[PDB]
Design a binder for this molecule. Structure first.
Ligand SMILES: Cc1cc2nc3c(=O)[nH]c(=O)nc-3n(C[C@H](O)[C@H](O)[C@H](O)COP(=O)(O)OP(=O)(O)OC[C@H]3O[C@@H](n4cnc5c(N)ncnc54)[C@H](O)[C@@H]3O)c2cc1C
Ligand SMILES: Cc1cc2nc3c(=O)[nH]c(=O)nc-3n(C[C@H](O)[C@H](O)[C@H](O)COP(=O)(O)OP(=O)(O)OC[C@H]3O[C@@H](n4cnc5c(N)ncnc54)[C@H](O)[C@@H]3O)c2cc1C
Lengths: 426, 426
């Protein structure tokens, strides 16, 4: 009754836990057949952002819930199946499942004039139910819609093979003996190339804009464990950048030596890509770096340097769009596409609505959603209060100006936070 | 007529090339159906030291013959199939195949009282032929016989699964869905574990004595490219050790943090194991480090720490014995098992017999066998000469004392040379 939680992935489970601890009644609605969010999809063969070789790139003890450690037998970087199993175990332990409605997709969420929210949901039959709830917490993730390149290169319509997005990608043994191009250089791109590199006959890695590729580990420590270290926090933002630049050079040399393009920005400016594999796969000839794709010639892909390769498939690892189809007016934004949420959570003008998990930090999101969940629970039952709308808008404007100043315009920049100072105010 | 070369792998092809350039007639006898030595066996499904995932761990431009570069499209670390194809291409280019007798196994080599050598060979039929040759060059490799642990752990005879050597290992998809233990920490052990780590359900890495595990690359340079660098040769043996120890720490931390045993010797003392993969496979939980195997309990392996695991297979990656079954008195040795060859090539008491490739340097053997081949060719047609037997024995005693002093006793220590000073005298 009191709260409808949309989604039972890592974020929504944290919200359900925080609400349950305060005696706040709630129901959690999940589209999938089980809890876990993206982490259970591979393994269920379901189409989603993950893939069968996906592991954490964050340390296990900083990715698990703080009051619910993962099994001691788990490694530092558990597999997706281990994470999914861990998340379902939490739900069981926390007593959340009697509040979870599976195979229930939220279709529409509207604010009623007297305050509560009307939520329409569709069950497994396809039936539709209309319920009213006092408040709504959105935990539906932001890796929802595939983002393919604005213009697909010329000739894509007359391509003898299959063009797909990483969402459609699952294993790679599905490309055994084939020839495949991977487009991009994010986390998905390097992992998928690496996987393809052991199944396909030829794996090409088409890159246009360079990113800094970083090993998962320096000095034996994970990069996220490094940021928590006190000596690292004692260093100045340039002593850090300096420290990393030197460590990278020693650990792997220069990016250009791998046939990759050098980024136009320093290591911490922009997104780093973590991989223990991709540079080595290039040295062994199992992945061939290329520049952008210029066109499609039947069974062949032509690149902007005049070279061409036969290709049975192209896998676009170009990311996801943040979308909220059940919100008619969408997530609050500032036209520029900049998200407008107070402390990254609260809409300034929609009382009783909250967004949890819509933050992109360095490292695991778990401590962030835990603090958001706890704060939202106290907002729900009146133990915490909000500023007036103007003052909330003041914090939003200040946060955005600091973002433009830092990452200027790009995409998704307006949910970026640094885990340290953000957690500090909770 | 003049020279019989035993073996048409990398070493024997180099010998044939050096002899052909001097007009020295020769025939090269090879057991296998083609040239290439170990490098063609995977790919032909043949049992041998290699495996289907085996790549060079040496740089391509320092592993190829100096007058015959590998294709420019080859990567830094070519696959075994690329190396095998490259070696056959050399043989064709160098005009060696009309001198090569394939599917011909040498059965016996005996010195006749008047000087020449009687060689008995067996062809494809199984027929035996006896031929006399003026001189014999042995290029039969030293990775011939499997070396399994002196005592297999108790209970091996009542083991529900299969115990095999790395010689018998080929791919790993042959262990799909299974549970496997790998014994050892050499090059074969880490590569095979890494491969198993993507096929098997569980891969355990049983290690007793610790070795230093080193990435194939530091500062973007291969470790063998580093040793040739002039700044590295300008450094003192401790400035080097010091330099590496620090670089390792930055590149991967400490071995003990991976659940591996720390070696009892500094990095350059003993054999280093090169791998870009094994430490990361451990962090992802895809390889589980263990100590020695204490026993076999049906379908389970018990380790010296009291733990146990179900296991369908155990792959012993414990190396190879150096053997010469066609030499009745064997390779000349000093009883201690120490090889007794002048400049690592020449027996002191057997005129007209030579051993090429029986050296273990840091990095690729190719420049060494090239210099040995050229020198042997000049020995064969009288353009170079040898010391008296006592003086040759003097060089052998000096070399051995320096070996014991350096690597003390161990196994195979008596063919170890440092590529730099060894090439320097040719
Ligand atoms: C490829 C990839 C790799 C990542 N790797 C790491 C990593 O190594 N370490 C790390 O710390 N973080 C990682 N992350 C980020 C983070 O762990 C995930 O984004 C995390 O799963 C976020 O959880 P969530 O609950 O916010 O979102 P999700 O996992 O997306 O869960 C959202 C849930 O909402 C449900 N839902 C959506 N719409 C509806 C609807 N209309 N009705 C009902 N239910 C709905 C979905 O079915 C889903 O179950 C990764 C993210 C991606 C995409
Ligand atoms: C697993 C492994 C990995 C290696 N990786 C590298 C690497 O990455 N880089 C590098 O530089 N070096 C590497 N080496 C070392 C080196 O490249 C090989 O040892 C090299 O193949 C040596 O060539 P060879 O001709 O001396 O020996 P082999 O390759 O063993 O060739 C010997 C030949 O003699 C033949 N022969 C033997 N007995 C007879 C007989 N009675 N009659 C007829 N023919 C006979 C055999 O059939 C074989 O073809 C590796 C070695 C091993 C075992």
């Amino acid at each position: 009754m009191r709260v409808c939680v949309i989604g039972a992935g890592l974020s929504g489970l944290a919200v359900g836990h925080a609400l349950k601890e305060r005696g706040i009644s709630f129901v959690c609605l999940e589209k999938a057949p089980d809890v876990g969010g993206i982490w259970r999809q591979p393994g269920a063969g379901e189409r989603g952002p993950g893939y069968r070789t996906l592991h954490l790139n964050t340390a296990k003890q900083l990715t698990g819930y703080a009051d619910f450690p993962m099994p001691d037998a788990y490694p530092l970087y558990p597999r997706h199946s281990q994470v999914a199993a861990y998340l379902r175990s939490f739900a069981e332990w926390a007593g959340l499942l009697d509040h979870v409605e599976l195979r229930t997709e939220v279709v529409s969420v509207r604010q009623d004039a007297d305050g509560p929210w009307t939520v329409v949901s569709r069950g497994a039959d396809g039936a539709q139910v209309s319920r009213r709830f006092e408040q709504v917490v959105v935990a539906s993730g932001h890796h929802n819609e595939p983002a393919l390149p604005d213009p697909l290169p010329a000739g894509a319509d007359s391509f003898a093979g299959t063009i797909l997005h990483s969402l459609d990608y699952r294993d790679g043994g599905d490309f055994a003996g084939r020839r495949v191009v991977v487009v991009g250089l994010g986390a998905s791109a390097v992992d998928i190339a690496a996987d393809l590199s052991r199944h396909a006959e030829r794996t090409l890695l088409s890159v246009r804009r360079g990113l800094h590729i970083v090993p998962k580990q320096l000095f034996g420590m994970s990069v996220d464990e490094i940021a928590e270290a006190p000596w690292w926090n004692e260093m100045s933002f340039d002593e850090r950048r300096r420290w990393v630049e030197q460590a990278l050079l020693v650990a792997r040399g220069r990016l250009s030596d791998y046939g990759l393009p050098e980024p136009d920005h320093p290591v911490f400016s922009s997104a780093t890509t973590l991989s223990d594999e991709i540079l080595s796969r290039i040295r062994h000839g199992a992945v061939t770096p290329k520049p952008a794709i210029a066109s499609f010639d039947g069974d062949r892909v032509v690149f902007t340097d005049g070279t061409s390769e036969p290709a049975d498939a192209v896998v676009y690892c170009t990311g996801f769009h943040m979308t909220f189809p059940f919100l008619p007016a969408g997530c609050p934004m500032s036209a520029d596409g900049s998200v407008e949420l107070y402390r990254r959570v609260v809409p300034a003008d929609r009382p009783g609505l909250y967004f949890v998990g819509l933050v992109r930090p360095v490292g695991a999101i778990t401590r962030l959603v835990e603090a958001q969940a706890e704060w939202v629970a106290r907002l729900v039952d009146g133990a915490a209060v909000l500023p007036a709308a103007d003052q909330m808008r003041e914090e939003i404007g200040t946060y955005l100006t600091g973002i433009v100043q830092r990452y200027g315009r790009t995409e998704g920049a307006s949910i970026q936070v640094d885990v340290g100072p953000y957690l500090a105010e909770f």
